[PDB]
């Protein structure tokens, strides 16, 4: 909560050193380790350890039970996918504080969904939040981040889907950041730099990685370099899950498939990391099917939807 000086033991001198290391939120310090804090100029161990304990205390991070357990869950807001059936399968829409994955063959609509959500983000009617655990000024001026990994982002389609929704296409584009990553290093660094955007006053509420694994699969082809691949992707996933919790934003990723009828690539690292997993498949014409096959509290379910000039519908 921006004012670091409210932290016991942290005065203006100390507060200065911190804002530098990217630390400028109470949660960020409460979830830090002594090591990553002492890496800053003159921040000792006892100080780093003490402020970490104070931050946790401040953000009240302890044992919770009963009604408090339900309150915590009220901070999760959801974004509509444009499909009534898909929204009902997600039990509302896409959840914040989680990583949800859309895997599927070519043309199954993975990228279309990514584009639609950028548009939907700019429509308060598309956002479903509990007033009890989410203040409106927290949803104010929401922005999306699209990490394009294959070069498929299309300003045109966002605009078209915007018209189809009834918003201004330019509006959506002005509130959507797009970073073209040519490799896993750029992909991972862009994800870690999302903090600097929030630091610059941007309210990042939607983070998209399309595609989540194409770079890794192409950079570590040899299978005697699989442990290598999984390790780097594991750090990426952790970075993604953390920023989803910390900034109460939704992280959305797409995944390709491979035979072995098919399964999303990325191995275990992606399996455990993604909270909601979907398989997208084609049907007749513009019809598509979204199969939820993994989640912590929802049963497997299918949703039929369409891809049209308007975008995602039905
Ligand atoms: N402007 C449009 N109007 C109607 N349909 C469209 C439009 N743009 C794209 N589509 C449809 O979207 C389908 C492909 O969607 P897309 O999201 O790119 O697939 P994908 O899952 O990302 N596959 P891949 O690129 O291999 O990863 C097409 O084959 C078109 O029928
Ligand atoms: K394609
Ligand atoms: K593609
Ligand atoms: Mg989470
Ligand atoms: Mg695609």
Swiss-Prot record:
Residue sites binding ATP per the record: 104-111
Gene3D superfamilies: 5' to 3' exonuclease, C-terminal subdomain, P-loop containing nucleotide triphosphate hydrolases
GO MF, one annotated term: ATP binding
Pfam families according to UniProt: HHH_5, Rad51
Domain of life, per lineage: Archaea
One record GO biological process: DNA recombination
Keywords, sorted A to Z: ATP-binding, DNA damage, DNA recombination, DNA-binding, Nucleotide-binding
UniProt record similarity statement: Belongs to the eukaryotic RecA-like protein family.
Chain's role: Involved in DNA repair and in homologous recombination. Binds and assemble on single-stranded DNA to form a nucleoprotein filament. Hydrolyzes ATP in a ssDNA-dependent manner and promotes DNA strand exchange between homologous DNA molecules.
Protein name: DNA repair and recombination protein RadA
Species per Swiss-Prot/TrEMBL record: Methanococcus maripaludis
Gene for this chain: radA
């Amino acid at each position: 909560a921006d004012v670091l000086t409210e932290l016991p033991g942290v005065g203006p001198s100390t507060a200065d050193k911190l804002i530098e290391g990217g630390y400028l939120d109470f949660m960020k310090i409460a979830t830090a380790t002594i090591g990553e804090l002492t890496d800053i100029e003159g921040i000792s161990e006892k100080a780093a350890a003490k402020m970490i304990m104070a931050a946790r205390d401040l953000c009240d991070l302890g044992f919770k039970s009963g009604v408090e357990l339900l309150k915590q869950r009220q901070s999760v807001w959801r974004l509509s996918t444009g499909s009534t059936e898909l929204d009902t399968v997600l039990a509302g829409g896409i959840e914040s504080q989680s990583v949800t994955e859309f895997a599927g063959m070519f043309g199954s609509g993975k990228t279309q969904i990514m584009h639609q959500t950028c548009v939907n983000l700019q429509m308060r009617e598309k956002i479903f939040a509990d007033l009890e655990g989410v203040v409106e000024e927290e949803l104010e001026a929401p922005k999306a981040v699209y990490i394009d990994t294959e070069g498929t982002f299309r300003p045109e389609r966002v605009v078209q889907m915007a018209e189809g929704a009834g918003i201004d296409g330019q509006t959506v584009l002005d509130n959507t950041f797009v970073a073209r990553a040519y490799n896993s290093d750029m992909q991972m660094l862009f994800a870690e730099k999302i903090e600097d955007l929030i630091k610059g006053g941007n309210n990042i509420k939607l983070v998209i990685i399309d595609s989540l694994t194409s770079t890794f699969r192409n950079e570590f082809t040899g299978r005697g370099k699989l442990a290598e691949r999984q390790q780097k992707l594991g750090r990426h996933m952790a970075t993604l899950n953390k920023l989803a919790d910390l900034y109460n934003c939704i992280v959305l990723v797409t995944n390709q498939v491979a035979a072995k009828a098919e399964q999303a690539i990325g191995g275990h690292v992606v399996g455990h990391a993604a909270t909601f997993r979907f398989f997208l498949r084609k049907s007749k014409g513009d019809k598509r099917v979204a199969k939820l096959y993994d989640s912590p509290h929802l049963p497997d379910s299918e949703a039929v939807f369409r891809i049209t000039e308007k975008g995602i519908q039905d």
